[PDB]
Structure 1
Amino acid sequence: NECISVKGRIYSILKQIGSGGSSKVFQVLNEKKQIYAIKYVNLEEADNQTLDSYRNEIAYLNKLQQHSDKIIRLYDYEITDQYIYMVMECGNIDLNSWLKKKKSIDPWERKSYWKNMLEAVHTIHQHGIVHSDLKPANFLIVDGMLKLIDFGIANQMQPDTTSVTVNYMPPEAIKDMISPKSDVWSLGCILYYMTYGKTPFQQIINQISKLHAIIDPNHEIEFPDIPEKDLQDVLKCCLKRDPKQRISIPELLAHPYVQIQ
């Protein structure tokens, strides 16, 4: 019967979904035995860089959810000098965990998840954010939909277990040692994974030349023919290494793959 109070109301902790650095996310019930997610950040030690990333996340989450229901909802929050509590709509599960168990995706459901992710990413681009590190873990499944959680700022957390990648990074991020085009690359890797059941360079299991493969022009990604050729076309347009020739989000929204059927 571990509990959390937040701006008046009490919540029972059903379990800890995940953790990350100084954060924790709990699946909880309110007094009306309704389910929610609560994120907790122990601010006790945390530099002004960490503090500000979390303050920025909360502001954008509060702003953005008026413009799109593909952004996870922030219902209430409590913030002091010691801690943060955020009450949010709780997802059934994150998309990474969900992919890693499913055999094969229903084609109409892949198309629908795809529209969901485009809308969400589109929404954050309109308000001046480039995620830059998109991956399946950033999307939750709720009400048969995909909703975005992470904005790039704030430290990513990891699902917890009761025991004890880089496949999505855009090429121009590797050569950065970054624009809305970088999120379309990462979205194409997810859709590609949803189509061919595998990430473009998911087999180059050694990292340094996984990276090398990604930035290498005369390394070619394979697009086996498939029934839905509009989907073959989406993937080929997303996965162009040259950012300036890569398809954009506004264009992807006008594409037959999302507009027909």
Structure 2
Amino acid sequence: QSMSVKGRIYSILKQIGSGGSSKVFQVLNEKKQIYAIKYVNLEEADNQTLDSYRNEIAYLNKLQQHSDKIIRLYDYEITDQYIYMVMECGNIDLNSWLKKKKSIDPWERKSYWKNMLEAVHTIHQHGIVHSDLKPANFLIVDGMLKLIDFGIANQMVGTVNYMPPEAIKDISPKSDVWSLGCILYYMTYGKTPFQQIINQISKLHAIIDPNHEIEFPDIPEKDLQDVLKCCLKRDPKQRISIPELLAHPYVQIQ
């Protein structure tokens, strides 16, 4: 119920996240300030894994100044057994909140989409394709949305629902546009595009079969309907680019 990271001592309040060999805590510094610490455990970490983590941290740290739609990382300590990462404490990850939330105020959802693009666009500039975006990857801070991770590090929920067809036979920035697509879709018709389907092989075949009409129910926002149709184009060159998505009317026009 208390840790030290580069000497400084943080008092845990609760555990606000967990995965792989990693806990995330909500904590207080000396000046009674709040943070999130991600403890990562390395005692079972193979070499490539150990690099993957060093890489992912390298980058998280870097693209701090290149954008505020990326979770802040204030400090880290790193040794052969553990990594501790001192980030800002968000309110909730997107995915938890989408679950609880009734329907989403159109203005909020568009605002959020703008941050998904700002964030993701940043990492593509730097060579990174995330190639595994789900709601879980984004954290609401001060009603603003930030990318947490860059999919660079290895693992220790399986989920095919956000997966772009061109990687249902195995890298492009277009892969992330699909996933962001499914995230927006989720935020729009309250489901992912291939959720109804339960047979995960029937599903995997649905995502690649151009014979499969993806439905996009009529909604007031014709701006928004376009963007979904545009992001969910099974051919990666058919698909809309992110610099295109940032000038799109849905995100551009009042």
Band of TM-score, shorter chain: over 0.9
Distance apart, 1:205 and its partner CA: 1.5
CA shift, 1:156, in A, is: 6.0
Q: How big is the shift at 1:128?
A: 0.3
Does 2:72 correspond to 1:73?
Answer: yes
Could you list the per-position Cα deviations for residues 57-104 of structure 1 after superposition, in whole angstroms to 9, with x for gaps in the alignment?
Answer: 110001101110000011010011121111001111100111011110
1:12 alignment partner in structure 2:
11
Closer, same or farther: CA 116–202 of 1 in aligned 2, 3 Å: same
Render the CA deviation track for 1:8-54: whole Å, top value 9, x for unaligned.
Answer: 21111111122222111111111122110101112122100110111
| C-alpha distance in 1 between matches for 2:48 and 2:200 | 29
Check the 8 A contact 2:94/2:139 in 1, yes or no: yes
- Asked if 2 retains the 8 angstrom alpha-carbon contact of 1:120 and 1:148, the reply is yes
Distance 2:155 2:123 in 1: 17
- Matches of 1:156 and 1:203, distance apart in 2: 28
Contact 1:140 1:146 in 2 (8 A): yes
Moved more, 204-213 or 107-116: 204-213
- Paired residue secondary structure (1:76): strand
Task: Name the SS of the counterpart of 1:253 in structure 2.
Answer: helix
Range that drifts further, 183-192 or 15-24: 15-24
Cα distance in structure 2, aligned partners of 1:84 and 1:63:
17
Native 8 Å contact 1:120 1:147 kept in 2: yes
**Alpha carbons 2:197, 2:203 under 8 Å: kept:** yes
Q: Distance in 1 between matches of 2:217 and 2:22?
A: 41
Percentage of pairs with the same residue? 98
Q: Distance in 1 between matches of 2:189 and 2:229?
A: 13
- Counterpart mapping for 1:32-181 below 5 A: 32-155=31-154, 165-176=159-170, 178-181=171-174
* Alpha-carbon distance in structure 2 between the residues aligned to 1:237 and 1:154: 29
Shift of 1:155: 4.2
Unaligned stretches of 5+ residues in structure 2: none
Whether the 8 Å contact between 1:92 and 1:140 is mirrored in structure 2 is yes
CA deviation profile, 1:130-171 (whole Å, cap 9, x unmatched): 0001110000000111100121122469xxxxxx92110000
Deviation of the 1:254 alpha carbon: 0.6
Task: Evaluate the alpha carbon distance shift between residue 116 and residue 156 of structure 1 in structure 2; reply closer, same or farther with a 3 A threshold.
Answer: farther
Residue pair 1:20, 1:155 contacting (<8 A) in 2 also = no
| 1:198-222 Cα deviation digits (max 9, x unpaired) | 1100111121111110111010111
SS class of match (2:177) = helix
TM-score with structure 2 setting the length: 0.97
Number of positions where the alignment pairs a residue of Structure 1 with one of Structure 2: 253
Distance in 2 separating the partners of 1:123 and 1:244: 20
Bigger mean CA offset, 51-60 vs 19-28: 19-28
SS in 1 for 2:247: coil
Is the contact made by 1:11 and 1:28 (CA closer than 8 Å) also made in structure 2? Answer: yes
**What SS does the corresponding residue of 2:205 show, helix, strand or coil?**
helix
Contact 2:64 2:70 in 1 (8 A): yes
**What is the CA RMSD across the aligned residues, in angstroms?**
1.6
Tell me: CA distance 1:216–1:196, structure 2 relative to 1, closer, same or farther (3 Å).
same
Partner of 1:37, secondary structure, is strand
Is the 2:60–2:149 Cα contact (8 Å) retained in structure 1? Answer: no
